[PDB]
Amino acid sequence: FVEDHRSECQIGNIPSSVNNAKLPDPFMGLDGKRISSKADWKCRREEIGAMYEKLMFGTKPRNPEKVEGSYSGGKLTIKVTDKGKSGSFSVKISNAGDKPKPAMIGFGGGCGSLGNATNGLDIAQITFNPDDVAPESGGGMFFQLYNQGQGTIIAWAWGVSRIIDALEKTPEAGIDVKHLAMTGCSRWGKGTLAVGAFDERIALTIPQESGSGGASLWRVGAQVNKQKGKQFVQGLSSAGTEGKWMISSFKNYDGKENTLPFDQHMLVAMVAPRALLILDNAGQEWLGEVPSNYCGQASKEVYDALGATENYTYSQEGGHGHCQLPNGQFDEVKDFMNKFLLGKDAKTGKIDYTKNTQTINFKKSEWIDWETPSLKDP
Ligand SMILES: [Zn+2]
Ligand SMILES: [Zn+2]
């Protein structure tokens, strides 16, 4: 039970430019060799994260000197010691536990945007206000401790990682750290994806309407915008500027998405093989209906290769308001939370899109020219 295995893996050269109008291969090691075993994924996963930290998010500070947790009055207060100073933040908690309880962590300050989809599930709720660590205006407690030009998203992933640190040594909070989910919508759907991708202790990642910078293909977004003759979908530059989410260099890819050494199917692949339920909308122009769908479809290759097809679902339902989840997706939320948080079996693993407003025609031959290997068991 571990945040990541980065220190167990040798990270080689990270190029910042390629020439590839197709999706980059996620099974291609930095050492130039394709992986063949499921055991090779431990380190291949770290190599992808290191690429995102170098190229898009910024470096995730690791191994903090000390994390202290205290639980009082339904609020968990986390004090982090690092780099000569201290930084503190607190999260609200609902439900409790001698008898620890599985928990959903949600951006807020509401706790995420799943609404009544969780009603009837005896799980705890932890609200994380990302402004406590890194407001989109800049500044924040994170940047009191650190100063390597990171963006705000990786500061939120750091934040949630420190919540889990404090939880592991605060049993009076009454939370089962072995059964934790993460969720959030829109800007906090981009935040949720990165959170679950960069902390392996998140057992269920539920990014909602995460859009550009989230689970949406940079190359497909740029294609759609060329087909429309205008910025129909939120483009790379805009996602690389808004909210200080990304490092300042990332927006320089904007006219040249084919030079990206990655695409967002590889961020999704950082969550594998842990459970991942992507809740998407449709008919939202800026959100990117087609590039999000195509990211959803393309990302299945890594989960299939690891033999974890049952742990990944992309669910797109349009025809409803932004971040207001329709009842047609309540069954998804309940099935995954029962399965991966509460130990109750359910049929999971699906690629489903309905109530679209654009033509959905994902042809693997256009976007994927690498074979999906058969990763062997050791
Ligand atoms: Zn690992
Ligand atoms: Zn459903």
* Structural domains of the chain ordered from first start: 6-367 (3.40.50.1820)
CA 160 to chain centre: 12
Q: Give residue 213's region: left, alpha or beta (phi > 0; psi -120 to 50).
A: left
366 is in an annotated binding site: no
Distance CA 76, CA 63 (A): 21
User: Which listed ligand is nearest to 331 at the C-alpha?
Assistant: 2
179 is in an annotated binding site: no
Angle, helix 152-168 to helix 187-198, in steps of 10 degrees: 50
Instruction: Strand 85-94: give its sheet, edge to edge.
Output: 66-72, 75-82, 85-94, 124-128, 101-107, 175-185, 204-208, 275-280, 312-317, 350-354
Q: 353 is written with which tokens?
A: 């899109």
Active site residue 322: yes
Distance CA 209, CA 278 (A): 8
Q: Output the CA 40–ligand 1 centroid distance in Å.
A: 10
Distance CA 116, CA 324 (A): 10
Distance CA 179, CA 71 (A): 19
Q: Output the CA 270–ligand 1 centroid distance in Å.
A: 9
53 is in an annotated binding site: no
Q: Which of 186, 212, 292, 315 is catalytic?
A: 186
Distance CA 31, CA 303 (A): 22
Q: Give residue 128's region: left, alpha or beta (phi > 0; psi -120 to 50).
A: beta
Residue among 279, 283, 277 nearest 355 (CA): 283
Q: 315 is written with which tokens?
A: 């669910």
Q: 80 is written with which tokens?
A: 């982090």
CA 83 to chain centre: 27
Question: Helices in the chain by DSSP H: which ranges?
Answer: 41-52, 142-145, 152-168, 187-198, 218-228, 236-239, 265-271, 289-305, 330-340, 364-367
328 is in an annotated binding site: yes
For tokens 């980059």, name the residue: 24
Task: Respond yes or no on whether the N-terminal peptide bond of residue 273 is cis (omega within 30° of 0).
Answer: yes
Distance CA 78, CA 216 (A): 33
Q: Which of 70, 86, 238, 322 is catalytic?
A: 322
5 is in an annotated binding site: yes
Method: X-ray
Q: Output the CA 228–ligand 1 centroid distance in Å.
A: 41
Query: Alpha carbon of 278 to those of 52, 114, 134, 231, 374: distances in Å?
Result: 20, 12, 24, 24, 25
Active site residue 299: no
